[PDB]
Design goal:
Helix content is 67%, strand content 0%. It has 2 helices and no strands. The chain starts with a helix and ends with a helix. Belongs to the conotoxin B superfamily.
């Protein structure tokens, strides 16, 4: 359940920083 988020990782790094 962590691969899908790592393979796609949609604007996750930014949303996570904004």
């Amino acid at each position: 359940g962590e691969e899908e988020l790592a393979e796609k990782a949609p604007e996750f790094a930014r949303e996570l920083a904004n």
